Amino acid sequence: FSLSCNNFNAVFSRISTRLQELTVCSEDNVDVHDIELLQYINVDCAKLKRLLKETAFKFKALKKVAQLAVINSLEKAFWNWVENYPDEFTKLYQIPQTDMAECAEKLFDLVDGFAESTKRKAAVWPLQIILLILCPEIIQDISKDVVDENNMNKKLFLDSLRKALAGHGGSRQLTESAAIACVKLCKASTYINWEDNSVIFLLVQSMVVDLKNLLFNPSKPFSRGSQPADVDLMIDCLVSCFRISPHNNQHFKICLAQNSPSTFHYVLVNSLHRIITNSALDWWPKIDAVYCHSVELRNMFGETLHKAVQGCGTDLETRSYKYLLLSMVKLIHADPKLLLCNPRKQGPETQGSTAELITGLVQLVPQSHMPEIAQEAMEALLVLHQLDSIDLWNPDAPVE
Fold first, then answer.
1. Which DSSP category does 3 fall into?
2. Per the record, what is the consequence of mutating residue 44 to V?
3. H or E element: which one contains 15?
């Protein structure tokens, strides 16, 4: 990456030749390691146009494995641009640029022609969305009557996407694929300042209600087919929704309840752990908007601690409690104030809320069964002793 910020032409010359070579061969070849360099090279808006234009010309003549390879890499290159240059992504909606829209639209049709079977469709849907977003006007036209061919192809794309997301279609593959695709659309929306308030925001609201019913449904958890539930997918969904409408979060409570599975409790404690440590854009909501929930989190740290020491003295179920506990301790190490708010204060017959938590951490230091938690619980107690965090123990009377 660092070797491509300046000498972009040097790196880009290796890829361009490879595509030409793969065009000549009449037999599909499985050597595409050179194509997959796009995942890493630094990219900019102007440079990103260069990758789209060149790929458009040659995508019609490549082979099956090459065609798939260019798609995935070209899909990941987009997020390197948005992550590193958020500003340029915003301007794309304040001031229209007809050059970017044309490049995205042309590549859209070629990809659509490639996909004809259900299995192929599941592979390309996550990319096309990223392209339809780049040409804002085509989205608006779909709302009204549809041109014969300019936008008829794109309009059919959405209706197929929503139908599969709800689950009416009899195809598990597409249902899972639509979940992956629509979570990327929500993620990208956050960068748009929404002062434009383009149809993007109105488009997200249409699916957000249908996405959560599919993911945060305790009765029928969403499993790809191998794992009990794809946790990493749910973290992205919950972290992105919070940033859109922080205060009106009715699905924070679903995870925060005690009756919910133990997998949801895992998603909620790592979603909070990204808001704390990964927040570049300023106008996003911050961790302060969650301090009203400190009471529930302390209780969740109570039972989990109780059921982890007790278990060590089902096998799989007990193993879960050790992962949830390890993550909660890492949370205190990042923002202690999230758990030392709304103190209970010392009671005539009951101990305070700060001591109850402080003692819990100590009883993990001398453990030998859990050598990795005992290492983390030491760091947490060493961060609560800093002069900054000592006022929070009891602001009424700290020294005593």
1. G
2. In NF1; reduced splicing enhancement
3. helix 8-24
Nominal resolution (angstroms): 3.3
The phi-psi region of residue 345 (left if phi > 0; otherwise alpha if psi is between -120 and 50; otherwise beta) is: left
In one-letter notation, the amino acid at residue 146 is V
Our separate counts of H helices and E strands in the chain read: 17, 0
Quote the crossing angle between the two packed helices 8-24 and 45-58, to the nearest 10°: 10
Q: Of 188, 90, 98, 82, whose CA–CA distance to 135 is shortest?
A: 98
Residue type, 275: I
Experimental method: cryo-EM
The token pair at 266 is 């895992």
H-helix or E-strand spanning residue 51 = helix 45-58
Cα within 13 Å of Cα(203), Cβ side: 28
User: Scanning the structure block, which residue is given the tokens 């539930």?
Assistant: 229
Q: 3-class SS at 228?
A: coil
Q: Which of 59, 76, 63, 153 is nearest to 111 (CA)?
A: 59
Pair of tokens at residue 158: 């959405």
| CA 275 to centroid of chain Cα atoms | 11
Place of tokens 């794809």: 230
Burial grade of 235 (CB within 10 A; 0-12, 13-18, 19 or more): middle
Query: Mind giving me the DSSP string for 67-133?
Result: HHHHHHHHHHHHHHHHHH-HHHHHHHHHS--HHHHHHHHHHHHHHHHH--SHHHHHHHHHHHHHHHT
Nearest to 71 by CA among 22, 19, 128, 28: 128
What's at 163, amino acid-wise? K
Task: Specify the amino acid at residue 56.
Answer: A
Please state, in angstroms and rounded to a whole number, the distance separating the CA atoms of residues 28 and 72.
18
Q: Are 311 and 318 in contact (CB under 8 A)?
A: yes
Q: Please report, as a single letter, which amino acid is at residue 324.
A: L
Q: What is d(CA 179, CA 181) in angstroms, rounded to the nearest whole number?
A: 5
